[PDB]
Design a protein around this ligand. Structure first.
Ligand SMILES: *[C@](O)(C(=O)NC)[C@H](C[C@@H]1CCNC1=O)NC(=O)[C@@H]1[C@@H]2[C@H](CN1C(=O)[C@@H](NC(=O)C(F)(F)F)C(C)(C)C)C2(C)C
Ligand SMILES: *[C@](O)(C(=O)NC)[C@H](C[C@@H]1CCNC1=O)NC(=O)[C@@H]1[C@@H]2[C@H](CN1C(=O)[C@@H](NC(=O)C(F)(F)F)C(C)(C)C)C2(C)C
Ligand SMILES: [Cl-]
Lengths: 305, 305
């Protein structure tokens, strides 16, 4: 029992982190086989970053201008190319610690672990959600760029996020490993704001199931609701619409607790309309939306990697 | 910017986890050099655990009765001994992945990372505090026993916790790596309850400093207080006394923000007396006490390992 925000074990990703330096700019890279992936703004000075022409800056660089270090060892760069907002440095040595891996573009509402890194060295690991407005609520300082986000499925590391920038409100934005941004953001130092965020309804329901599994049952009411009537009420409180796909994904938790998804929807509607009245659920005074249905099942079933 | 509950990177500990099986009992062990450390109740059946005589059960076991597995590889056991609540199995192979390490007994109020494991395989990592009542608020299922808690200091892993049991309220108890329990608990299935818990004051202050560093400053008032007057008020709200040692440990955050510890104490006193009035601090509606002063400095300075 107990329910905690839990990250994936980071060891398979720790073995892939390197430092990339171009002139006086240093940030983190991800070394898989004989390629190092890092944010393309490694090739800018401070002044370049207000309106950089990356294609123009990269034409003036050659392989030897990229200093890649794996702990104390320099890796010799033997090719370079830009893909969207990511630089790919081919190196003469394959990383012997490369795990089985995939590059995946995640959907808003999905969670992942971030391995925050500085100078190619791991600082810490924590769990994030891709927000509906395409930001993450991270913890990132200057030097963190090229830190990565990932999921593990048994032996396979699915890389989904590379860190690039901080937006107003101290939220974060970055790319998939093909260098395409999540959301409407660009890698330029100019005024950019996230859209209005929305609460990930399907994740709040998953967490109420987690609360029932742990014996926190006070908020269960005697009512059901229709999907249509639930969605009209959720809309008012800036909750995402709940779709039939979301109901189907909640099926395993529903089956395990014996509580129909639309009965839990009736309980969530009463919490939104009436509040929590100074009570907590799983130790929280606010409804939590950064646990997916799969995160709840993994943690409450002891899935390992 | 941003502030998150962050765990240590787990890779150095992931390379030490093994499975130990004695009869039909399986749990996790920690393999350092040529020794495997695990909870001594690996040698009990279900029925033994209501009132076990561990010395008696262990005299009837020999080396070959302990099945240790490191992934697919069986490690041959060549000696065994009991130290307090921990079994030590000597094996014929040194773990080539053994990090620089120490065994340390932590103090209440200190934090550590737990690597939750099942069948010798990592499931997840999260950050805990040793509560004043010698429990942790973990997430542990049947099969998690012998999961470990640790801190990292550059290259050195300080192991502080081995998991043994779950108490009422879904809190957790275990031993240091010398097999001595934290708190008054015993490894027997009998009625045991944690004492009344208390809030770790020095950690709440550390987190209010973290809030100021991140630009959440609404709760700062124009007052100071004396250590004596603060402690009389804290006592009422089941906060630990703040000692001069605690004030000295808060010195670096105090110096960085320019806010004297006793001025922050005046702000905390007003939050305890008046509440938060539906506002949040660093996104939380409750005062958080599981960040140490050192956790705040590491995260807000980007300390790496
Ligand atoms: C990253 O370049 C790094 O760590 N380099 C060593 C850095 C990470 C960033 C700094 C503070 N916390 C973080 O997450 N990223 C940047 O500095 C990016 C680079 C330049 C401007 N960057 C920003 O993050 C801007 N943000 C914006 O301009 C805004 F508003 F659009 F988001 C700030 C103002 C420096 C935070 C790039 C976008 C190329
Ligand atoms: C551990 O033995 C394991 O994982 N084995 C494979 C297991 C971990 C435990 C189960 C549920 N969540 C957990 O953290 N520990 C135990 O079963 C211990 C063993 C027997 C009784 N144990 C308990 O944790 C008891 N607790 C108590 O009796 C109490 F109240 F004192 F705490 C429960 C009731 C099974 C939870 C030992 C103490 C030897
Ligand atoms: Cl909260």
């Amino acid at each position: 029992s107990g329910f905690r925000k839990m990250a994936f074990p980071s060891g398979k990703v720790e073995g892939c982190m390197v430092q990339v330096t171009c002139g006086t700019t240093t940030l983190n890279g991800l070394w898989l086989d004989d390629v190092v992936y890092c944010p393309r703004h490694v090739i800018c000075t401070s002044e370049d970053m207000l309106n950089p022409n990356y294609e123009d800056l990269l034409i003036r660089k050659s392989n030897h201008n990229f200093l890649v270090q794996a702990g104390n060892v320099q890796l010799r760069v033997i090719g370079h190319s830009m893909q969207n907002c990511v630089l790919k440095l081919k190196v003469d040595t394959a990383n012997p610690k490369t795990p089985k891996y995939k590059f995946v573009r995640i959907q808003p509402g999905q969670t992942f672990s971030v391995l925050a890194c500085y100078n190619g060295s791991p600082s810490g690991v924590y769990q994030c959600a891709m927000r509906p407005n395409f930001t993450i609520k991270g913890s990132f300082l200057n030097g963190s760029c090229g830190s990565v986000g990932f999921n593990i499925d048994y032996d396979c590391v699915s890389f989904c996020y590379m860190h690039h920038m901080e937006l107003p409100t101290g939220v974060h934005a970055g790319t998939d490993l093909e260098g395409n941004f999540y959301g409407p953001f660009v890698d330029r130092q100019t005024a950019q704001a996230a859209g209005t965020d929305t609460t990930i309804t399907v994740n709040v329901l998953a967490w109420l199931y987690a609360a029932v599994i742990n014996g926190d049952r006070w908020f269960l009411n005697r009512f059901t609701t229709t999907l249509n009537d639930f969605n009209l009420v959720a809309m008012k409180y800036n909750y995402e619409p709940l779709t039939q796909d979301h109901v189907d994904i909640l099926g395993p938790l529903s089956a395990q607790t014996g509580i129909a998804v639309l009965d839990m929807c009736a309980s969530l509607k009463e919490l939104l309309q009436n509040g929590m009245n100074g009570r907590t659920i799983l130790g929280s005074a606010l409804l939590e939306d950064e646990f997916t249905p799969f995160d709840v099942v993994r943690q409450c079933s002891g899935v390992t990697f």
